[PDB]
C-alpha cells in the first residue's frame, strides 16, 4: 500500500549486504519498508571493533559521504535499495543531521570548511529550555548551525543523494533538537526546507517531554509515540493489557501522524537496559497490540541474535549481521499481514470477559486480533462483527468459532491470535 499504512522493520545494525540478502524473506514477513542504521561516514571508535556494544559509534558523523565500515559502501547501499524494490519494499534511512561526532579532530575538513557551521559543543544544561535543547550540544556532540543556510544545503544535498540511491524515506535522529520555524528568535526554516524532497515518508525521533513540541513537529513529519512505548512495555511487565491503559497514545498527536513501537533500539541498547528485560513472547504480545491498531505506523525492533531477557549483547553476532529470526516469526508475520489487509478499517479495542489480561482489537468487520498476556489458557466468548464460520488462528495453532455474532474458542497462555476470512 504505502509506507505510512504498513509496518517498518528496523534492521538495526544489519549491513547493506545482509539486508540485500534477506530482501525476499523481509517481504514474505509482511513489512512494507525497512529502516537502516545511519549510512553516512562516522567515527569508527575502538578501532572499528564490531562488538554489538559499539553500536553507538554509528551516531557520531564525521562526514556526510555515504558509507562506513559497519554497514558497507554507497555502492552496496544502492544495490540493497534496488534489491528491495524488486520485491516492492521501501527503504528508510536513519538520518543523523542535528550534530556530528564530539571528536573535533575526527570531523572531516569537508564540513569544517563550511564557515560558521556549528553552534559549538557546549553541553545542554536545562532540558526544559527549548533554546538550550535546540541551540546547544547534546552530550558533547558538535551541534550543527542549522540556521546557516549553507549547512542546510550541505545536509539536504546528502538527503537528496540518498533518495537518488534508492532511499524512500527518512527517520530524523534527535529531531527534537533542531529548531522549528516558529521557535521565536532562534527558529529557522530548516525543517520546511530539508523535508522538502521526493521522500515518500519521513518521521522524526521525538522523545516526548515538556519541551518536545510534538504537534508542532507533526506539521512537517510523523513523530515517535515514546510515551505510548512506556505504556505498552508497562502493560507487558504487569501482564495487564487493560484497554484503559493501552488505547490512548499519550500524545496530542493523532495516530495518523504517529510511529509506534514496543521498544526502540535506545531503550534496548543503552546501559540503562530499559526494555532489554522483555522476551520474545513479550514482543509478540506487544506487537499484536500496537500493530493491530489503525492510523499509526508500527516499528519492529530487530534485536541482536540471542539478545533478550536482560541480555543486550550475548556475543553470538556482531554489527552488520542479521538480528534474531523473530522478525519473521509466524506470530509477528501474521500480525504484519493483518495490519496490511486491514488498512482503512477502523478499530475497536476491548478486554474479553472483563479479563484485563486478554486484549482484543476488532478492525471493522473484517478482522480480529487477540492477545493473552496471562499464563493460563482462557476461553474467550465475546461480541464480534465477523461473519459466521470457522476461523483458524494464523498466528499459531488452534481455531475459533463465530455463532450468531459471538466469537468463541480458546486462546492459549502467552499467545496471539489473528482471525479473518480468506
Ligand atoms: Ca541542536
Ligand atoms: Ca526505492
Ligand atoms: Ca544485562
**CATH number of the domain that 261 lies in?**
3.20.20.80
Task: Yes or no: say if 297 and 263 are a contact pair by the CB < 8 Å rule.
Answer: no
Give 290's contacts (C-beta < 8 A, 6+ positions apart): 228, 232, 260, 261, 262, 296, 298
H or E segment to which residue 340 belongs: helix 330-341
Write out the E strands in 255-329: 258-260, 297-301
Statement to judge: residues 71 and 211 lie in one domain: yes
Active site residue 74: no
- CA 310 / ligand 3 centre spacing (Å): 5
- CA 167 / ligand 1 centre spacing (Å): 25
Statement to judge: residues 401 and 318 lie in one domain: no
Residue pointed to by grid coordinates 488498512: 343
Statement to judge: residues 89 and 36 lie in one domain: yes
Statement to judge: residues 109 and 82 lie in one domain: yes
Experimentally, the structure was elucidated by: X-ray
Q: How far apart are CA 412 and CA 333, in angstroms?
A: 19
Sign of torsion over alpha carbons 37, 43, 49, 53: negative
What ligand has the least distance to the C-alpha of 136? Answer: 1
What ligand has the least distance to the C-alpha of 78? Answer: 2
Measured over all CA atoms, what is the biggest interatomic distance in the chain, rounded to whole angstroms? 73
N- to C-terminal Cα distance for the chain?
19
Active site residue 274: no
Give 92's contacts (C-beta < 8 A, 6+ positions apart): 3, 8, 33, 34, 35, 36, 167, 168, 169, 170, 171, 201
Domain count, the chain: 2
Q: How far apart are CA 53 and CA 139, in angstroms?
A: 18
- Report residues near ion ligand 2: CB below 5 Å: 81, 85, 166, 168
Statement to judge: residues 303 and 351 lie in one domain: no
Q: 387: burial class by Cβ within 10 Å (0-12, 13-18, 19+)?
A: exposed
Residue positions forming the annotated binding site: 85, 98, 134, 143, 166, 168, 177, 273, 310
Give 396's contacts (C-beta < 8 A, 6+ positions apart): 330, 331, 334, 412, 415, 416, 417
Q: How far apart are CA 174 and CA 91, in angstroms?
A: 20
Residue positions forming the annotated binding site for Ca(2+): 85, 98, 134, 143, 166, 168, 177, 273, 310
Statement to judge: residues 295 and 412 lie in one domain: no
What ligand has the least distance to the C-alpha of 151? Answer: 1
Domain span at 410: 345-422
Check 79, 94, 173, 328 and give the catalytic one: 173
Statement to judge: residues 243 and 366 lie in one domain: no
Q: How far apart are CA 266 and CA 233, in angstroms?
A: 14
Name the domain boundary from 344, 375, 392.
344
Check 79, 205, 214, 263 and give the catalytic one: 205
What resolution in angstroms, rounded to 1 decimal? 2.8
Amino acid at each position: 500500500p504505502s509506507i505510512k499504512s504498513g509496518t517498518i522493520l528496523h534492521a538495526w545494525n544489519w549491513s547493506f549486504n545482509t539486508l540485500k540478502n534477506n530482501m525476499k524473506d523481509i517481504h514474505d514477513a509482511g513489512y512494507t519498508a525497512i529502516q537502516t542504521s545511519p549510512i553516512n561516514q562516522v567515527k569508527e571508535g575502538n578501532k572499528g571493533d564490531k562488538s554489538m556494544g559499539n553500536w553507538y559509534w554509528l551516531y557520531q558523523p564525521t562526514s556526510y559521504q555515504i558509507g562506513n565500515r559497519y554497514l558497507g559502501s554507497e555502492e552496496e547501499f544502492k544495490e540493497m535499495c534496488a534489491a528491495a524494490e524488486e520485491y516492492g519494499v521501501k527503504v528508510i534511512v536513519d538520518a543523523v543531521i542535528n550534530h556530528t561526532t564530539s571528536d573535533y579532530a575526527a570531523i572531516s575538513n569537508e564540513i569544517k570548511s563550511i564557515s560558521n557551521w556549528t553552534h559549538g559543543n557546549t553541553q545542554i544544561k536545562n532540558w526544559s529550555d527549548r533554546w538550550d535543547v535546540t541551540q546547544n550540544s547534546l552530550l558533547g556532540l558538535y551541534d550543527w548551525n542549522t540556521q546557516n543556510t549553507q549547512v542546510q544545503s550541505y545536509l539536504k544535498r546528502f538527503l537528496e543523494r540518498a533518495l537518488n540511491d534508492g532511499a524512500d524515506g527518512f527517520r530524523y535522529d534527535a529531531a527534537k533538537h533542531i529548531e522549528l520555524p516558529d521557535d521565536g528568535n532562534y527558529g529557522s526554516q530548516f525543517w520546511p526546507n530539508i523535508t522538502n524532497t521526493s521522500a515518500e515518508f519521513q518521521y522524526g525521533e521525538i522523545l516526548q517531554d515538556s519541551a518536545s513540541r510534538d504537534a508542532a513537529y507533526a506539521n512537517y513529519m510523523n513523530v515517535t509515540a515514546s510515551n505510548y512505548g512506556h505504556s505498552i512495555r508497562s502493560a507487558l511487565k504487569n501482564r495487564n493489557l487493560s484497554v484503559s491503559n493501552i488505547s490512548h497514545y499519550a500524545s496530542d498527536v493523532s495516530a495518523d501522524k504517529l510511529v509506534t513501537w514496543v521498544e526502540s533500539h535506545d531503550t534496548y541498547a543503552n546501559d540503562d537496559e530499559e526494555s532489554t528485560w522483555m522476551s520474545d513472547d513479550d514482543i509478540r504480545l506487544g506487537w499484536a497490540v500496537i500493530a493491530s491498531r489503525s492510523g499509526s505506523t508500527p516499528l519492529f525492533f530487530s534485536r541482536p541474535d540471542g539478545g533478550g531477557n536482560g541480555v543486550r549483547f550475548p556475543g553470538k553476532t556482531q554489527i552488520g549481521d542479521r538480528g534474531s529470526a523473530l522478525f519473521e516469526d509466524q506470530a509477528i508475520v501474521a500480525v504484519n499481514t493483518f495490519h496490511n489487509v486491514m488498512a482503512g478499517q477502523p478499530e475497536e479495542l476491548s478486554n474479553p470477559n472483563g479479563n484485563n489480561q486478554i486484549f482484543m482489537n476488532q478492525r471493522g468487520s473484517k478482522g480480529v486480533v487477540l492477545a493473552n498476556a496471562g499464563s493460563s489458557s482462557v476461553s474467550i466468548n465475546a461480541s464480534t462483527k465477523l461473519p459466521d464460520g470457522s476461523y483458524d488462528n494464523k498466528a499459531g495453532t488452534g481455531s475459533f468459532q463465530v455463532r450468531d455474532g459471538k466469537l468463541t474458542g480458546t486462546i492459549n497462555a502467552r499467545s496471539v491470535a489473528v482471525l479473518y476470512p480468506d
